[PDB]
Amino acid sequence: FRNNYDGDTVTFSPTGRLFQVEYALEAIKQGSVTVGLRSNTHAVLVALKRNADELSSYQKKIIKCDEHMGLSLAGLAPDARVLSNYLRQQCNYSSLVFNRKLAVERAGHLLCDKAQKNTQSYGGRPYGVGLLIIGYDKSGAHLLEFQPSGNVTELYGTAIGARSQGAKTYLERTLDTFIKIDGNPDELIKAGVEAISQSLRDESLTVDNLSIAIVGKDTPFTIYDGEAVAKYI
Amino acid sequence: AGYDRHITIFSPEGRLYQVEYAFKATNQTNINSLAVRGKDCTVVISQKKVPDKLLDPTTVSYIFCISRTIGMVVNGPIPDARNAALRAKAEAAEFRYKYGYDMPCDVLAKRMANLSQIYTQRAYMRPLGVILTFVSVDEELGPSIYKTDPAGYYVGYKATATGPKQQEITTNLENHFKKSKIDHINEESWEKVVEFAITHMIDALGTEFSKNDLEVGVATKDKFFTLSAENIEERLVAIAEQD
Amino acid sequence: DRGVSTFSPEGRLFQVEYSLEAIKLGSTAIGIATKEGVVLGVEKRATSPLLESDSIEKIVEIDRHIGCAMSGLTADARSMIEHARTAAVTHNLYYDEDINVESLTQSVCDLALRFGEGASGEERLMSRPFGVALLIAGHDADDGYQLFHAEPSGTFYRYNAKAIGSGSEGAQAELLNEWHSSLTLKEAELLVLKILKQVMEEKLDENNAQLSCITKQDGFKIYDNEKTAELIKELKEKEAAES
Amino acid sequence: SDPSSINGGIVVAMTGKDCVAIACDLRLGSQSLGVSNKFEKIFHYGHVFLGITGLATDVTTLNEMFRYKTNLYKLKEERAIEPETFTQLVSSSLYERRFGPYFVGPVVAGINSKSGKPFIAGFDLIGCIDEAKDFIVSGTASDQLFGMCESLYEPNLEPEDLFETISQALLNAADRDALSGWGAVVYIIKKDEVVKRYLKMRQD
Amino acid sequence: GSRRYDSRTTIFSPEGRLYQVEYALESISHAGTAIGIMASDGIVLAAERKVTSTLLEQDTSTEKLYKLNDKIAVAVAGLTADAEILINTARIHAQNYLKTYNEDIPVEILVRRLSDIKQGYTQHGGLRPFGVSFIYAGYDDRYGYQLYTSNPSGNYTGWKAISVGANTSAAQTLLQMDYKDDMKVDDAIELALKTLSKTTDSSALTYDRLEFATIRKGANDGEVYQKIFKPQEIKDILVKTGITK
Amino acid sequence: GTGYDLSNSVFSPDGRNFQVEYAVKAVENGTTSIGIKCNDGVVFAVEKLITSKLLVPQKNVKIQVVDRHIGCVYSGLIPDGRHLVNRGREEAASFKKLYKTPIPIPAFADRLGQYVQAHTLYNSVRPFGVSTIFGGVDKNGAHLYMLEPSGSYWGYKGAATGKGRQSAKAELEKLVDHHPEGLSAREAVKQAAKIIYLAHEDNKEKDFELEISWCSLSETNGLHKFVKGDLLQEAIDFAQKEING
Amino acid sequence: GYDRALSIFSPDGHIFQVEYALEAVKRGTCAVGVKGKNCVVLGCERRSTLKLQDTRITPSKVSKIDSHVVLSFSGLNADSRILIEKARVEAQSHRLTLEDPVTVEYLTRYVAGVQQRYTQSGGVRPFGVSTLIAGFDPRDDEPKLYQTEPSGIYSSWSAQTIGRNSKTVREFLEKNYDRKEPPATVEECVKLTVRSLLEVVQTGAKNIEITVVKPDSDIVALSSEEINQYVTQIEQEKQEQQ
Amino acid sequence: NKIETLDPALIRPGRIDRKILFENPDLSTKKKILGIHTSKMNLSEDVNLETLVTTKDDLSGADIQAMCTEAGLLALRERRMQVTAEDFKQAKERVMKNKVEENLEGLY
Amino acid sequence: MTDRYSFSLTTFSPSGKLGQIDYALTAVKQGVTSLGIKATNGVVIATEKKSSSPLAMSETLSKVSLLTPDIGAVYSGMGPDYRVLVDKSRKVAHTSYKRIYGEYPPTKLLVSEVAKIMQEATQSGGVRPFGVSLLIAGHDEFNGFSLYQVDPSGSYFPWKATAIGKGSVAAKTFLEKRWNDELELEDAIHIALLTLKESVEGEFNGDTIELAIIGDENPDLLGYTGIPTDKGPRFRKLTSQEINDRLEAL
């Protein structure tokens, strides 16, 4: 039964992993659609911000971790914060100790380990949140996918949130073209907005839902927020 | 509390389910062992098999040399055997610094038993499944065999066997010792001691075994050594030199 | 008892869902933020001659620029206030200035995560989550007048007006129609009284309602019993002349 | 200031035959200035008498300490502590925190309830043992007292005569000090009666 | 972890009870009997040792009588083991009061502490409580002779005649009648022994099935001298009342 | 039977806990990885699955280094394998400082062994569900080892694990026999590549990208290095020549 | 570790353990406080059925929390010692630190606070006690009456009654008090308090214990003799209103 | 006996809308319950229906039934058909004690 | 990660019993016939020696352990529980008394120290309670010779003879009848073999009885052949030949 292996986080089941872990992967889809894309010199993050009401003000779906780094969340909010603080801590120490910015790869592997530890601990839980973490280090432009069970993948492009498969079809076609444009920010950015509106099929797009963040070879972590995303549609 | 076999606590009957199941199916891993005492040696024969041609059988170990002089024969599986080995090794070494003296079989047996018992009462650990036979030729007792078993029970032997050919081994040695009026045979050279062992082994388990199917560990005064593959065939051919 | 790490097939924790159930049973708290102030109003409720009804209120001051009104369990809102005062006091000492209402909600929400058995990520010291939700209203010199709804789950949203409590479904619906972007402090307080009257099964007195306001020449200020009643006196006559 | 001679004190114990006597001064000072002529340094746990000379404070801490140890032992075994037993207890306790400060010289006197033999012991600040069965002395004028006791002492004394030795010994030792002035008590001890006699001696 | 490998029996019940406590009193009601009669020149204490033999020693007559002080003692009804931890700690709690203020603990302070430790075992920890009920036989100069009982729940009540253990019900019904409001020790002794026989089935009341202690003022013994009667003094008093039958 | 499917803190009658069985199963449910011992070294190769062109080559290699001369590759689930290795690394750094020498391949087997075995004495810690094949060259010869998730491990001459475990042992067992142990380290890359090809035949729902690395005392000088460039490229060709399709 | 759960949510948005704490109080004895505008009266039961209790060492229901402040309760004595001790310490803590006599509101916050903690925090359960806290603030002649539950919630009340047949004693009291004209004289406010508590104790006039608190540490416990007299009188009053 | 052992989803509001309590017989009711049970009787004239009700502390109708039944027995054993006051009183004392027993958690 | 087990594993049942103590006792009833006798001129304790194997030493095997020099203990119950318990009893007895009061703990005081170990273990979780019962037979020079029973919970009671294990009650009947105080130690050894022959049938020897006495001195048990300073041990375990000699002595 379901109820037999569900109660604490310390049990495996014949499936090969615990039920609860799959339910954490499921939550990401509930939360906000965020697409990730890169060329080879810059990498672009596009995110849809949702609120609850007219008289509600948006919840931020981009949290800036450094002046050369930020991430998007999709899924459970409270864990996304507990993670973004950990990444802040990890970053700073690297700079204090080693004079080092913190590679996307390097961060992913530390984050994974933290995730195993909280899935062997019985009172502990999977985070229930997936993250697309972007950066330009001296490894080049990067996009990584983090999943809350410790699955870390380096990608050209991907999506988490509402119809991930949706965006993925778009990206996989337009792929070969946009990624060889290397040294023009605007094009890769324009492909990001073109993609995200076609994943949608029970929502619509608008200016102040959308928010774009780009990092690169000549773009330090910069958000286009509200009004200023119009000129990338 | 919980239950009597989801965590380790007494059974309805005052028994412990976990120690009795630790006795049974940890000797059925394709292992059978005997230990007999020499005159100035101690011999162990133990089965030890490799099912692939791709498994290097050197690393395959189930007679361990705990110290330079101490041996420990484990009946039971390698995950357990290394938890007991780590403890044994540590105990041996600690003893050597602190008390200034080499570790007797009996002291090691007793210490490990009491420790297992504590882990038996714990509700977040198990007793190890392994059966541990500790061997050397002590200068404080002669050739010695002391065996611990998994319940926190342990006791000294003069000759022992484990695996369900226990009865066969025992009876052949018992009749023999009642006639000769000794429980140790007299012969100097290790070679003749291993031949005595084999004689009782072959009869009792009713088969002979290959070099790589055996592993023979010999205790001598201030050394314990394992016999190389050729060395274990030499002995099997040497009785057959007689025939 | 009940899992503390066990999610629904959707992936929403039992404990979070149960948190949402206690909230819905308190008396309404309604905030409208305007361009001259934030109004927070509550239904205090209960009138008895064996009750001191003007010694109990649900609008408590955190700081000289921050209040909160609550809805749900009141005992729980005491632990939330103790954490919140300590965090705000320590920040005023370090940088000499006002703490941000969003910032406060995140610091509190971090300690809302502990419940149950511990983690290796976190030391979970409590047993349940908090069963009260809050409207925290304030002023800062860098975003002016603001109104915030903290859920005990972790989510906190900024609003221009929001109602929470039992009677929130109706209340919110009224808030929208009455809300516009040239709304002022004086109008907003009168309107609060309209909403409160409508949904009551009683006559609105200041021993079942309490008003409060924020002006930045005085900080968080409680609209006192004497003033709140004068406002009630003015309401009853004007309403009862539209009929 | 002084470390233990603010008030001073000396203590003498002797054996008779199947009896003992324990005697002490009653000085209390603030330095060489005498303030009071009464400070009683002898307490008893049954037929064990315990006198401890030195710093006032330190004497107190051991007395309440032996009081706690004696009370739980008495209650549990249904038996009061005997002198022989008490001597091992004084030693062990001193050993437990000799690297804590102690400025003490406890002296035990009593007659056994299991071997009947008169029993005396001396103890040191670190808790060296003095096994002695004639006299044992401790305190500020201990150098002097050992000279006085070794010559004056006559053994196997029965109570009236034991009194005379211990008093006269004590009175004449005391006169070469003023850190042993301000009155004195002799306790002459049997199992059957304990006589307490005040002496008259100088003051400064 | 431990959530589904343990249970919670230290929680409340849908009556307001705690499972283990209610049950603990039950354990006590089939254990051996302790009786407390407070007089105004003494304290008379009686206990029945249920079942005695010539293979047990009957010679040890501290088996349920323990002195915690030379001014306070308890009579035990429940287990020796459960008893042992609170005695030893109570004796320690004494020495602390004695060291601090140079004066012995009143009865009431010492009871209130005991009860707080016992409440503690169900209040946090998940632990189990003790299963032994104490009758306090005690002194004050504020309150005269004092007689208390305290329970594993930690409620404590003032008495001048009480019982805990088995046959509680029978002893107390005779006792309330035959009580004299101010009385001497010797009168108390007559009353007690009379009650005792008729609470012990058939002919069984003997000296060596009894533990007796009396706490008298004396005038060859000191004020509040506790005499814990050893066999031979029980034999005497039985013959004097003539109640041995 | 039961209690042994949720716990490891008690012992099965089968001698094999049901939770342990489930751990092995997730290993066979990963990808193929293999390991080849040779007459001077070890060569490691893995099948990396290609699903989409949104993945990037050589940043999702499942070969991870420990120390300087140990290359570690696995089958099963990714998070378990990385955490297991991160622990190996930490013990490895500690080792190097203290004994001023690199961590052995036998030592590392023990280090891993004791972390896994620890989580199989406790129900309060959940063990690892990966089999990790590792090895290298050290001061005391060349070693191939395989760690299985019970906390069973041994040194092997050859190893495979995963989906393609069987097909890999077949193709390996023929090649090792033919050679004395696997000939030269050069040869071993070509041999490896044939093994991966046969192992692919159990996938056929994804394309693959071949990744090999080696540790060799005669053609690397005792360091773990990737095999790429010319050497990888001749190896793809050798496989496709003899194995057709 | 025993910081894990022992108090859990209800699906109804209560807490199981707090609902069960209130039941123990009801089975229990009855305590009441009625206000004048010169005093605050506290009545407490002592219904000794049995006559073998010695009642000078049988626990009381009246504690000093402070010299001008009292706490009365209905509930398990065992739990109530633990709360009573923490509340005395808190009065002395303020006294030490602020150089100021204690104010009633803060103490009530403190009493509320320990009980509130033990519901929220893991491997502890709330107390089995409801309390009434009353007294007078310094240099103040107006009465103060607070009620706290082991939920940890707190309120002021002009009068409140707790324990067994709380309904009956509220219902009665409601007819005999107005906030606009509460009693000025001790005698008549005490008469009313004794009369309510007569009606639930059954027989009692030595089993009822009255303690009347006037401003700043004039706290006086009326005796049996005095109470028997008011009960006589009440038996005269009930045939003047027949 | 109590309704806390029935699910609220088996009661089913809207068909079963009433869940009706049991309150104890009060003083007026005791007089009545008694009055009916003393009718069936042959007794002595020293019995005071009133006197016995007043000392009874809010006792169940069961107690009242029990008392009559108990009092008849004390008369039958004594070989008589008259039932004196003293008998009713003993039966009342015994049942009143057992109901009113609940010590240290009711009677704190 | 790691344990969190702090919830007591010994808990009350609806009757007032303690599940774990009830269970543990079943084991004790099924354990090896052991008795203890105070002869008044000594104390003799006997217990069943057993062998695992004929090829097995029973020198190592522990059925009679010296807890402190003048004191021995024997048991019925669970062997592994016994072994650890003996150890904690030996340790505290040595550290806390043997230069503090300058001698061994008195018998009653040592029975209380055991009692406490067992009770800690019953109160506290993480561990189940000891499953054992002991007969502690002793000598102390301030109480004479004594016999106690130590129960699994740590309840104790004084005895002057008893037996526990299987077949207790009848064993006590034979002992009750034959010995009634003031008896030579030797004679109590003879009575003890007789009680146990009737109790154990199938095969009986003095090579399956292990016998210890506290009730002798040798110079060898002062531990020196010089000039006394103290009294020393009075524990002496007999060898198998000496026991066969007393079996031959009618």
PDB file of N, CA, C and O in Angstrom, chain G residues 113-148:
ATOM      1  N   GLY G 113       2.367  32.192  28.484  1.00  0.00           N
ATOM      2  CA  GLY G 113       3.521  31.800  27.716  1.00  0.00           C
ATOM      3  C   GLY G 113       4.225  30.481  27.844  1.00  0.00           C
ATOM      4  O   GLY G 113       4.731  29.964  26.836  1.00  0.00           O
ATOM      5  N   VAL G 114       4.265  29.942  29.073  1.00  0.00           N
ATOM      6  CA  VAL G 114       4.825  28.599  29.322  1.00  0.00           C
ATOM      7  C   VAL G 114       3.928  27.526  28.815  1.00  0.00           C
ATOM      8  O   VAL G 114       4.378  26.493  28.319  1.00  0.00           O
ATOM      9  N   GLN G 115       2.520  27.735  28.992  1.00  0.00           N
ATOM     10  CA  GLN G 115       1.495  26.736  28.568  1.00  0.00           C
ATOM     11  C   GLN G 115       1.448  26.640  26.989  1.00  0.00           C
ATOM     12  O   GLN G 115       1.340  25.573  26.314  1.00  0.00           O
ATOM     13  N   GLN G 116       1.486  27.805  26.340  1.00  0.00           N
ATOM     14  CA  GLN G 116       1.564  28.066  24.921  1.00  0.00           C
ATOM     15  C   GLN G 116       2.756  27.434  24.338  1.00  0.00           C
ATOM     16  O   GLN G 116       2.714  26.880  23.192  1.00  0.00           O
ATOM     17  N   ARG G 117       3.891  27.517  25.080  1.00  0.00           N
ATOM     18  CA  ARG G 117       5.082  26.849  24.597  1.00  0.00           C
ATOM     19  C   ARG G 117       4.873  25.409  24.536  1.00  0.00           C
ATOM     20  O   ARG G 117       5.325  24.763  23.585  1.00  0.00           O
ATOM     21  N   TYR G 118       4.248  24.786  25.544  1.00  0.00           N
ATOM     22  CA  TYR G 118       4.362  23.340  25.610  1.00  0.00           C
ATOM     23  C   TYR G 118       3.425  22.638  24.600  1.00  0.00           C
ATOM     24  O   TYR G 118       3.655  21.482  24.346  1.00  0.00           O
ATOM     25  N   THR G 119       2.452  23.387  23.952  1.00  0.00           N
ATOM     26  CA  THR G 119       1.551  22.868  22.915  1.00  0.00           C
ATOM     27  C   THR G 119       2.370  22.938  21.665  1.00  0.00           C
ATOM     28  O   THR G 119       2.370  21.979  20.876  1.00  0.00           O
ATOM     29  N   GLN G 120       3.046  24.090  21.411  1.00  0.00           N
ATOM     30  CA  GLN G 120       3.836  24.306  20.220  1.00  0.00           C
ATOM     31  C   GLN G 120       5.063  23.491  20.109  1.00  0.00           C
ATOM     32  O   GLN G 120       5.438  23.027  19.037  1.00  0.00           O
ATOM     33  N   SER G 121       5.678  23.148  21.245  1.00  0.00           N
ATOM     34  CA  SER G 121       7.032  22.563  21.199  1.00  0.00           C
ATOM     35  C   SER G 121       6.826  21.061  21.443  1.00  0.00           C
ATOM     36  O   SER G 121       5.881  20.576  22.056  1.00  0.00           O
ATOM     37  N   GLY G 122       7.796  20.264  20.860  1.00  0.00           N
ATOM     38  CA  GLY G 122       7.718  18.834  20.682  1.00  0.00           C
ATOM     39  C   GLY G 122       8.331  18.030  21.774  1.00  0.00           C
ATOM     40  O   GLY G 122       9.363  18.321  22.386  1.00  0.00           O
ATOM     41  N   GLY G 123       7.653  16.929  22.163  1.00  0.00           N
ATOM     42  CA  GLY G 123       8.026  15.996  23.211  1.00  0.00           C
ATOM     43  C   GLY G 123       7.615  16.590  24.557  1.00  0.00           C
ATOM     44  O   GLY G 123       8.280  16.234  25.490  1.00  0.00           O
ATOM     45  N   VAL G 124       6.632  17.514  24.580  1.00  0.00           N
ATOM     46  CA  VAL G 124       6.004  18.032  25.805  1.00  0.00           C
ATOM     47  C   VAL G 124       4.588  18.161  25.364  1.00  0.00           C
ATOM     48  O   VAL G 124       4.175  18.271  24.219  1.00  0.00           O
ATOM     49  N   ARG G 125       3.636  18.097  26.382  1.00  0.00           N
ATOM     50  CA  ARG G 125       2.192  18.221  26.377  1.00  0.00           C
ATOM     51  C   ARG G 125       1.848  19.391  27.356  1.00  0.00           C
ATOM     52  O   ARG G 125       2.503  19.583  28.329  1.00  0.00           O
ATOM     53  N   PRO G 126       0.787  20.132  27.029  1.00  0.00           N
ATOM     54  CA  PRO G 126       0.278  21.238  27.875  1.00  0.00           C
ATOM     55  C   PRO G 126      -0.116  20.829  29.299  1.00  0.00           C
ATOM     56  O   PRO G 126      -0.414  19.626  29.492  1.00  0.00           O
ATOM     57  N   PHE G 127      -0.184  21.740  30.272  1.00  0.00           N
ATOM     58  CA  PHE G 127      -0.698  21.403  31.612  1.00  0.00           C
ATOM     59  C   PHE G 127      -2.213  21.073  31.607  1.00  0.00           C
ATOM     60  O   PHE G 127      -2.887  21.342  30.574  1.00  0.00           O
ATOM     61  N   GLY G 128      -2.709  20.447  32.747  1.00  0.00           N
ATOM     62  CA  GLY G 128      -4.036  19.884  33.020  1.00  0.00           C
ATOM     63  C   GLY G 128      -4.763  20.898  33.887  1.00  0.00           C
ATOM     64  O   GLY G 128      -5.410  20.485  34.872  1.00  0.00           O
ATOM     65  N   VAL G 129      -4.529  22.195  33.627  1.00  0.00           N
ATOM     66  CA  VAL G 129      -4.959  23.218  34.640  1.00  0.00           C
ATOM     67  C   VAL G 129      -5.485  24.434  33.937  1.00  0.00           C
ATOM     68  O   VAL G 129      -5.033  24.761  32.835  1.00  0.00           O
ATOM     69  N   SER G 130      -6.550  25.055  34.503  1.00  0.00           N
ATOM     70  CA  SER G 130      -6.973  26.347  34.045  1.00  0.00           C
ATOM     71  C   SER G 130      -6.801  27.090  35.298  1.00  0.00           C
ATOM     72  O   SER G 130      -6.769  26.512  36.378  1.00  0.00           O
ATOM     73  N   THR G 131      -6.568  28.422  35.093  1.00  0.00           N
ATOM     74  CA  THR G 131      -6.279  29.280  36.192  1.00  0.00           C
ATOM     75  C   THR G 131      -7.128  30.541  36.067  1.00  0.00           C
ATOM     76  O   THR G 131      -7.779  30.928  35.074  1.00  0.00           O
ATOM     77  N   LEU G 132      -7.187  31.149  37.237  1.00  0.00           N
ATOM     78  CA  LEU G 132      -7.557  32.527  37.483  1.00  0.00           C
ATOM     79  C   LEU G 132      -6.447  33.240  38.226  1.00  0.00           C
ATOM     80  O   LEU G 132      -5.976  32.819  39.264  1.00  0.00           O
ATOM     81  N   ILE G 133      -6.116  34.467  37.660  1.00  0.00           N
ATOM     82  CA  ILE G 133      -5.040  35.263  38.122  1.00  0.00           C
ATOM     83  C   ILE G 133      -5.798  36.590  38.417  1.00  0.00           C
ATOM     84  O   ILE G 133      -6.554  37.088  37.649  1.00  0.00           O
ATOM     85  N   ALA G 134      -5.551  37.152  39.637  1.00  0.00           N
ATOM     86  CA  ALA G 134      -6.115  38.412  39.998  1.00  0.00           C
ATOM     87  C   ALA G 134      -5.219  39.163  40.922  1.00  0.00           C
ATOM     88  O   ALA G 134      -4.268  38.641  41.516  1.00  0.00           O
ATOM     89  N   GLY G 135      -5.377  40.460  40.925  1.00  0.00           N
ATOM     90  CA  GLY G 135      -4.634  41.275  41.887  1.00  0.00           C
ATOM     91  C   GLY G 135      -4.809  42.697  41.457  1.00  0.00           C
ATOM     92  O   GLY G 135      -5.848  43.036  40.929  1.00  0.00           O
ATOM     93  N   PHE G 136      -3.885  43.490  41.898  1.00  0.00           N
ATOM     94  CA  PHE G 136      -4.004  44.919  41.805  1.00  0.00           C
ATOM     95  C   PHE G 136      -2.636  45.386  41.289  1.00  0.00           C
ATOM     96  O   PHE G 136      -1.604  44.971  41.845  1.00  0.00           O
ATOM     97  N   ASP G 137      -2.595  46.328  40.365  1.00  0.00           N
ATOM     98  CA  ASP G 137      -1.432  46.920  39.834  1.00  0.00           C
ATOM     99  C   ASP G 137      -0.769  47.874  40.807  1.00  0.00           C
ATOM    100  O   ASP G 137      -1.477  48.185  41.788  1.00  0.00           O
ATOM    101  N   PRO G 138       0.427  48.349  40.825  1.00  0.00           N
ATOM    102  CA  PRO G 138       0.883  49.169  41.939  1.00  0.00           C
ATOM    103  C   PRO G 138       0.238  50.511  41.902  1.00  0.00           C
ATOM    104  O   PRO G 138      -0.112  50.934  40.804  1.00  0.00           O
ATOM    105  N   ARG G 139       0.049  51.126  43.109  1.00  0.00           N
ATOM    106  CA  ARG G 139      -0.606  52.390  43.337  1.00  0.00           C
ATOM    107  C   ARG G 139      -1.917  52.493  42.633  1.00  0.00           C
ATOM    108  O   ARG G 139      -2.190  53.461  41.944  1.00  0.00           O
ATOM    109  N   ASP G 140      -2.787  51.460  42.767  1.00  0.00           N
ATOM    110  CA  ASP G 140      -4.016  51.326  41.987  1.00  0.00           C
ATOM    111  C   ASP G 140      -5.025  50.678  42.843  1.00  0.00           C
ATOM    112  O   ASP G 140      -4.741  49.706  43.544  1.00  0.00           O
ATOM    113  N   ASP G 141      -6.291  51.203  42.755  1.00  0.00           N
ATOM    114  CA  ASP G 141      -7.343  50.719  43.651  1.00  0.00           C
ATOM    115  C   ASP G 141      -8.463  49.980  42.838  1.00  0.00           C
ATOM    116  O   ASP G 141      -9.514  49.663  43.412  1.00  0.00           O
ATOM    117  N   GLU G 142      -8.249  49.733  41.535  1.00  0.00           N
ATOM    118  CA  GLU G 142      -9.298  49.055  40.704  1.00  0.00           C
ATOM    119  C   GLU G 142      -8.885  47.606  40.503  1.00  0.00           C
ATOM    120  O   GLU G 142      -7.677  47.253  40.417  1.00  0.00           O
ATOM    121  N   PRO G 143      -9.816  46.719  40.515  1.00  0.00           N
ATOM    122  CA  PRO G 143      -9.601  45.267  40.555  1.00  0.00           C
ATOM    123  C   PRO G 143      -9.189  44.760  39.233  1.00  0.00           C
ATOM    124  O   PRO G 143      -9.470  45.414  38.222  1.00  0.00           O
ATOM    125  N   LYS G 144      -8.383  43.611  39.185  1.00  0.00           N
ATOM    126  CA  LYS G 144      -7.902  43.054  37.956  1.00  0.00           C
ATOM    127  C   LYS G 144      -8.239  41.504  37.964  1.00  0.00           C
ATOM    128  O   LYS G 144      -8.098  40.959  39.074  1.00  0.00           O
ATOM    129  N   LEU G 145      -8.815  40.867  36.872  1.00  0.00           N
ATOM    130  CA  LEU G 145      -9.183  39.553  36.914  1.00  0.00           C
ATOM    131  C   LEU G 145      -8.949  39.041  35.506  1.00  0.00           C
ATOM    132  O   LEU G 145      -9.413  39.660  34.511  1.00  0.00           O
ATOM    133  N   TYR G 146      -8.149  37.959  35.413  1.00  0.00           N
ATOM    134  CA  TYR G 146      -7.633  37.438  34.174  1.00  0.00           C
ATOM    135  C   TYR G 146      -8.003  35.974  34.275  1.00  0.00           C
ATOM    136  O   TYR G 146      -8.160  35.393  35.314  1.00  0.00           O
ATOM    137  N   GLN G 147      -8.119  35.335  33.110  1.00  0.00           N
ATOM    138  CA  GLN G 147      -8.344  33.870  32.997  1.00  0.00           C
ATOM    139  C   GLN G 147      -7.382  33.352  32.015  1.00  0.00           C
ATOM    140  O   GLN G 147      -7.263  33.955  30.956  1.00  0.00           O
ATOM    141  N   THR G 148      -6.714  32.193  32.274  1.00  0.00           N
ATOM    142  CA  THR G 148      -5.843  31.689  31.287  1.00  0.00           C
ATOM    143  C   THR G 148      -6.249  30.234  31.193  1.00  0.00           C
ATOM    144  O   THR G 148      -6.709  29.617  32.144  1.00  0.00           O
TER     145      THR G 148
END
